[model samples]
Target: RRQLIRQLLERDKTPLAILFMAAVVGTLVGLAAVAFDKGVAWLQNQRMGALVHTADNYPLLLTVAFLASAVLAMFGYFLVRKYAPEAGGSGIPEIEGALEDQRPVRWWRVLPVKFFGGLGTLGGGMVLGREGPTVQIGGNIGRMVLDIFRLKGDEARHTLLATGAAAGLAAAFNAPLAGILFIIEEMRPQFRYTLISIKAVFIGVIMSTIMYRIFNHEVALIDVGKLSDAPLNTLWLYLILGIIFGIFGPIFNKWVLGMQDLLHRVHGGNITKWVLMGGAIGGLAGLLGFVAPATSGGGFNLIPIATAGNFSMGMLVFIFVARVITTLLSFSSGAPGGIFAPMLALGTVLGTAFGMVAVELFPQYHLEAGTFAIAGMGALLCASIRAPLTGIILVLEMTDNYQLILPMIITGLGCTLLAQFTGGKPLYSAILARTLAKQEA
Candidate 1:
């Protein structure tokens, strides 16, 4: 066994090995993402189901829900504190850091820690998305495969890393184009746009998409049905909305970092304090499930509802404000989660609310609120991430409202323009800067 292992390790790396491993990494990432999604849903149902059955027993149900969620959240916090500190928060920055060779890819520690830690945080109904951890896991898997196969070329390692990260996004959202665009546009600095790298990305995205479809079938991630297209006359409205988001985007970014700092100060690098704080927040989230379901979780459910225009204009704004606070709290708490989904939800609510008001004022234009909803879905993402192309493609793919492509482009571009003018840094880039700064400090 030692002789055989030595021989394999000594073998020269080939392009074929890199491509083959890309496919393997993509498939593994898809399977892991699917399992993570189902696990969170199952745990959610366990608590929600009890609440449903015990509607009459409000006191007991609240207790059960709070305790269940708190325990799960503490479980996640404990893992991150005890095992992998880097696994906390959105893991996207860590992947970017790894790509830039500024961070280590400790897959052996990260994979299991992020997987189970994410399950606990997300399952506890925290306002976190699975996509971030999925991306990190996928990238880690790529590195692991490279090491195992004894791949020696830096190019091979870089190709697989980007490929797996892209595949993870594709698998999580079932949006292959967005996944490809995410690396190309968002990680352009770190991603080498060589022929080999691009091919690996394409292959990884395709395979992961296939696996995603096998598990999820042909369903849109956010099903808003077929919405009416925006008229040329109404296009200006989207631009206005984009500008509005642009103005708020920088402020929102500042608040996110500020809250993060506040939490760090509160915890003061104490593991027990962090874990206990997480437990309290999780318990509060559990209580929120009974009080306001729309304000909790990753906010996916709220997207469809908000875009559907089921709630009144005031209610929409109220929920939006509530979610913004919850999102800030949950994300800034240094928990294992992502802000992408929550940001999407916030954009949806705010956009829908604006659309409602627009409808009332511009009755002559006869705008469909849903159209604005679709357009606004990507606006905040564009402004915050500074990745207009990725946001446009992601929203386009998720909603399948291709007719709104023009409006989406206008909104995304406008927001990006204003965000840049306002001197707002990209969220992930800022986070990575802070992470590196802390390491240096």
Candidate 2:
């Protein structure tokens, strides 16, 4: 048995073994993401279901909503602070840091911490997404798998990390191509762009996406329905949306950082105070959610519904401003969630608002509000994260809007160019830089 184990370890160092193990990592990541998605929904179900039953009783409903969310949010905050604070917030930066060997991958600590903690925060309806947790969980799962095989090398480590992250993303959004490009484009600096590593990443994304389809029964991640193609004349409007995103991206980042710093000062590194503060925010989220569901949560439910052109331009702007505040409070306070999905909602409303105006002004042009919505979603992601390729592919895959690619690309280029021109650093980079600075202290 000892000899056989040693032989397996030796074989794992070879090319075939590297690719084979990536398959293993991808499978686990998919299952983990599936469970996470269901788990988060389960929590939301519990909360929403309770509220429904108490609908007639205003006092009961109000208390239940606020109390449930506060307790759950506090639970998430307490868990991370007590067990693993690194599990807090969108953990994408941790993976970025891990890739460069500047951060440790404590899978045992992160896995349960992030998964259950995420359930609490997301379930509590804090404005956050499941995508970031999946990525962090994916990278950690890769580390766990690497440890099991007894592989020793920086090459194996980074490869697995990248593969796991890619597959994790695939499972989250079911966008295998974007998963592949996310690493190729976003982590280009940290990732070793060898043929073997790329292929290993490919295998992982392929397997994870397959696993996601198996569980999800093959659906586009976001279904805004089929949007109309952009006319050549209307392409310039997308550039305007792009410019808006480029300017908003940095302002959003600055506000988030400022609030984050403000929150930290309030908590003063005290776990109890931190959790309590988070609880208050969650409580407010619940109350606001009860009053206007659009202003809170990750906004996945709101995204499709919003693009139906249901709201007036004024309402869209109101929700946009409100969500910006909720996003700031929920994320800046260090909730265990992602900014991706929520930001998508932001772009959708704003884009739809833009399109509605354009449609009225240029009736001859014949525009669809949803088209600008799809373009805006990807454009904000491009500007905020500085990963235009990933953003373009992600929205492209998620929406199945093939004809809108030109508009998407145009918006992406505009945002990427202008966001940089506007002094916007990548959002995750800022978070990781803060984390490293805190670590040094």
Candidate 3:
């Protein structure tokens, strides 16, 4: 019995221990993400419902949505600008910076501010995503665990941070495989892709998935029915979508940087100006919501509807146009929000539009527009981020139509390659580089 105990004890090394701890970190990240989602939903329901119930009689609902979103946006911007500017954008870059040891992970300030501030801005119906905040928070949790455990190895710390972030993304979308691929594909620079590290990521993803399922139940994030495979002949349509996104991706990236620069110049560190700009954008979004809601907010709820084949080719184009503008404005205004979901939404709208047009042109082929929609679902992500595997898995997990995996792989590969050839850099990397350049200047 003593010899058996000694052998078992010998098996527990730092690698095994770290992997075990990574599971714990995954659970923590998932729980935090799940709780954050639930809390934000509750707050939004209460705030929006109250405003709607009362404003219907007094015309204040519109005003409240505007003011609430504006104030919340301001709060988010102020905290990020005042306390930790590094927490801005998608937070994924900051985690990358942390792993590279070029940036500090001030979780003490960032975690609370991002959580509550994100709840405020995102819950107020801004066209933003919670995944960014969740990923950063998850990375912080990994660091916190490291600190608590008194682990001193840089390798251990960095690996766990990546694990936490993967877990965070998994919980956000309820897509564990996508989460793992996200780190492997998107954060490749900082991630140490090794056998043990890979297994740790898998473990982290699984734990987070279990935790997410515990709260949200087992429902696919985006289901437009199992789309049929894209025919080999119709492959040209997907390449067309890729080429379109490839062009737009660079243009969009340039505009995003341009807008940030413009905003910074206008605000010039003025709190009032910043807050008012946030309010104006939020209010405008609310107005848009009242008029053409199909183009407003984060666009998560609009994806399935757009892909359900309900709209005509003209309507699809219109929706695509409206959302592209909204996405640009919302993300560029420095609103302490995320462009992740918005970009995905934009991709879906445009892809669906392309699919609709293709179906019309090739009615003889009996083509389903839904097939192109599925292929285009991740085209924007691939084009902008140049993470073909991440885009493929992310959308595959979201739609739960794994049968369309071949088209996803094909479209994502084409989009990223074309975009890269067109001098389009990864969106988050560009944002981080700009932030660093500004910080230095």
Error of model 3, residue 409, in angstroms: 2.2
Report the C-alpha lDDT of model 2 over 141-234, residue by residue, as the tens digit.
9999999898767678889999998998888888899888988777545445433288889888888888888878845556878888778888
Residue 274, candidate 3: Cα error in Å is: 1.2
State each model's CA lDDT, in order. 0.86, 0.85, 0.77
lDDT of the structure predicted as candidate 2: 0.85
State every prediction's TM-score relative to the real structure: 0.94, 0.94, 0.92
- Residue 21 lDDT, candidate 3, scale 0-100: 87
lDDT of 1 by residue, 1-441 (tens): 899999699654447767777888898888888888888989898988878777786688888888889999999999988989999888988988887888999999999999999989899998888888888988998888888888877778778888888988988889999999998877646445433377678888888889889978855668899998778898899899899988888889998899999988878999999999999888888888778899788888878888998878888888888988888888899888888878888888889988999999999998778788888887888888778888888888889999888888888788888999999989999999998998889
Candidate that scores best on TM-score:
1
Question: Could you tell me the C-alpha RMSD of candidate 3 in Å?
Answer: 4.6
Instruction: Say which prediction, candidate 2 or candidate 3, comes out ahead on lDDT.
Output: 2
The ten-residue window of minimal lDDT in model 2 covers: 187-196
- Supply every candidate's count of residue pairs whose N, Cα or C atoms clash at under 3 angstroms: 0, 0, 0
Candidate 3: worst-modelled 10 consecutive residues by lDDT: 187-196
Task: Give the local distance difference test score of model 1.
Answer: 0.86
lDDT of 3 by residue, 3-117 (tens): 9999697653447777888999999999999988887687667656766566664457667766766666677777776777667767887886676666788878888878877
**How much does candidate 2 score in TM-score?**
0.94
